[PDB]
């Protein structure tokens, strides 16, 4: 996260960390949506361009963290995966369209003041909150600059941008399954996700029922906090039927 600050304890209790066993390194960010499901970006698991194709056995999910590198003994929980599901039309060949994937934990986790799932949005909440100018929050333990790793979870609040601007900022083809967010060069405010933050959650707080919803997933950007550029996120609501389906089909 660039130009973001340190989070507070229990500020994003649904923030998960995908950890690799060997070598032991941070891979991506993810979020907890029930006591057995974690959601992330599919490129965090499969990205053939760079021979990336992890399997159940190769990852660890760490929930309840604040610190990036410490094993916060008695606060975080580490789970193993039972199954990983990548969206069937995930497009890694062109624009990372439908960048989403679900992970089933071996055993359910218990919630605590530090572990609590986030809400997935419903047509109405999507409709009322995904509006340009509205801010969302992104969190992660990713890099602090483009080219500088934090010791604690970082947070930054970014505005959603109007699609035409998003499109006119890159040469990549944008689809309706993505939205972009960030400040205009003109707004003298910055912030952005960066390497290491991928897979994590973009959330908004409903002013109707005070709950936090996860509207997008950190998917991609060109550089970190470059002016005239933005971050793109998977549109969770547009792919929610898929979600429901693997869940009530497999658990």
């Amino acid at each position: 996260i660039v130009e973001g600050s340190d989070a507070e304890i229990g500020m994003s209790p649904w923030q998960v960390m995908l950890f690799r066993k060997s070598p032991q390194e941070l891979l991506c960010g993810a979020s907890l949506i029930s006591d057995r499901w974690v959601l992330t970006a599919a490129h965090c698991l499969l990205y053939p361009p760079w021979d990336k194709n992890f399997t159940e056995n190769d990852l660890l999910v760490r929930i309840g963290k604040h610190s990036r590198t410490r094993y916060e003994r008695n606060i975080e929980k580490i789970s193993m995966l039972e199954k990983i599901y990548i969206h069937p039309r995930y497009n890694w060949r062109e624009n990372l369209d439908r960048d989403i994937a679900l992970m089933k934990l071996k055993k359910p986790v218990a919630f605590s003041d530090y572990i609590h799932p986030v809400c997935l949005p419903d047509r109405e909440t999507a409709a009322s909150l995904l509006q340009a100018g509205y801010k969302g929050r992104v969190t992660g333990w990713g890099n602090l600059k483009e080219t500088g790793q934090p010791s604690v979870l970082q947070v930054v609040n970014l505005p959603i941008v109007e699609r035409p601007v998003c499109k006119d900022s890159t040469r990549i083809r944008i689809t309706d399954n993505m939205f972009c967010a960030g400040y205009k060069p003109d707004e003298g405010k910055r912030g952005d996700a960066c390497e290491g933050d991928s897979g994590g959650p973009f959330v908004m707080k409903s002013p109707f029922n005070n709950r936090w919803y996860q509207m997008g997933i950190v998917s991609w950007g060109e550089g970190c906090d470059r002016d005239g550029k933005y971050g793109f996120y998977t549109h969770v609501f547009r792919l929610k039927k898929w979600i429901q389906k693997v869940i009530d089909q497999f658990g």
Binding site: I9, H116, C119, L129, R137, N157, N210
Partner: peptide, 28 residues
């Protein structure tokens, strides 16, 4: 999940974090 999105240390105790204001304030 019924109970989803309500944080034990904030919503559940009626405590706000330092920047949520910024967000609610952007919603209008």
């Amino acid at each position: 999940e019924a109970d989803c999105g309500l944080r034990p240390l904030f919503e559940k105790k009626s405590l706000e974090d330092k920047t949520e204001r910024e967000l609610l304030e952007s919603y209008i």
